[PDB]
Amino acid sequence: SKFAIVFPGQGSQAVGMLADLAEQYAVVKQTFAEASEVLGYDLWALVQDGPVEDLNQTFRTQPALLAASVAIWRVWQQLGLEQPAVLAGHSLGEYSALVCAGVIDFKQAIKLVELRGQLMQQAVPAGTGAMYAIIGLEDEAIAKACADAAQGEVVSPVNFNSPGQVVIAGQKDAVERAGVLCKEAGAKRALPLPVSVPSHCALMKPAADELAKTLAELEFNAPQIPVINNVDVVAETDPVKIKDALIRQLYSPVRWTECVEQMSAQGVEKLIEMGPGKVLTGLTKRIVKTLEGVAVNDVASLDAVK
């Protein structure tokens, strides 16, 4: 195949998502119904009606996004559409990729990502962590800025999203010091992100240790379609190593630009974003200028890509 499918994460959710697709394909509401059975609440109703403040809490957003992406995947499979060459996803999206590749049972994945969200929220006391988007600065300069700012505390790049789009996170004061240094190094902008969880840095390690205990209780199978992991940019096939990659993913940076580059290096020419919004699609052509990127999350978009 000359195309890949990628799955978005936190931030891509929207009240009303997938309404159009649900009207035409019963598998959408069926997928959400399965998710609701293991969550103990009506996930479809939350997604369609809100309250949005509840949908935006990570322990609800994660299963909402996982259900959304898996529902679209199920429509794709129902139509017997050609298989993608490889899958990948951004942070939560990696779980979506693993379900679609047959590694994790969907119902079990829904409970797993709900737990993942809970552990992330409970990881550090609110107000002690911070995240900043650094725009227009080379990865090497940002790494240096973080190293100099650290001064015994945690501060590191946590997302490599596109050339010139990098997110850093860690202890609040250290991140703030790093922002100043990035600006002094020439960054165009250093944007404080409204978030309490300093995701993907060493502060999440205790939470990862707890997540590891839960992964020991769930069966993972070999991937049916290759899945490129965020932590190592590897299409891992050993299920225990896939679990290890999820554990490490939690406290390690998301190497998204490399994931996309890896897809291109293999011969993929198009990335289909399977989930709400078009966030990842915006990154695709910034990473590899020749790649085509399209989002599929409604009847119109599904129809155009068939």
Picked from Cl ion, a second copy, ligand 8JZ, none, the partner binding residue 238 (CB below 5 to 8 A depending on kind) is none
Picked from a second copy, ligand 8JZ, Cl ion, none, the partner binding residue 92 (CB below 5 to 8 A depending on kind) is Cl ion
Q: Is 173 exposed, middle or buried (0-12, 13-18, 19+ CB in 10 A)?
A: middle
Near a second copy by CB under 8 A, which window of 66-74, 75-83, 95-103, 294-302? 294-302
CA distance 301 to 77: 16
**Both tokens assigned to 211:** 């997540």
**Residue 90 designated active-site:** no
CB 122 within 8 A of CB 204: no
Give the number of other CB atoms < 10 A from CB of residue 171: 23
Nearest to ligand 8JZ of 300, 305 (CB atom)? 305
Give me the count of residues in the chain: 306
Nearest to a second copy of 247, 254 (CB atom)? 254
Task: Out of 24, 77, 78, 83, point to the residue binding ligand 8JZ (CB under 6 A).
Answer: 83
Report 6-25 residues binding a second copy (CB under 8 A).
11, 14-16, 19-20
135 in contact with a second copy (CB under 8 A):
yes
Of 172, 167, 121, 133, the C-alpha closest to 150 is 172
Of 65, 45, 68, 67, the C-alpha closest to 57 is 65
Q: What is the H or E stretch that residue 98 is in?
A: helix 92-100
Dihedral angle over CA of 270, 275, 281, 283, nearest 10: -120
**Residue 200 designated active-site:** yes
| Per annotation, catalytic residue among 12, 69, 91, 199 | 91
Task: Out of 107, 205, 241, 278, point to the residue binding a second copy (CB under 8 A).
Answer: 278
82 in contact with ligand 8JZ (CB under 6 A):
yes
Picked from a second copy, ligand 8JZ, Cl ion, none, the partner binding residue 135 (CB below 5 to 8 A depending on kind) is a second copy
Q: What is the per-residue binding string for a second copy in 33-52, x denoting contact by CB under 8 A?
A: ---------------xxxxx
92 in contact with Cl ion (CB under 5 A):
yes
CA distance 151 to 127: 19
Question: Would you name the residues annotated as active-site residues?
Answer: 91, 200
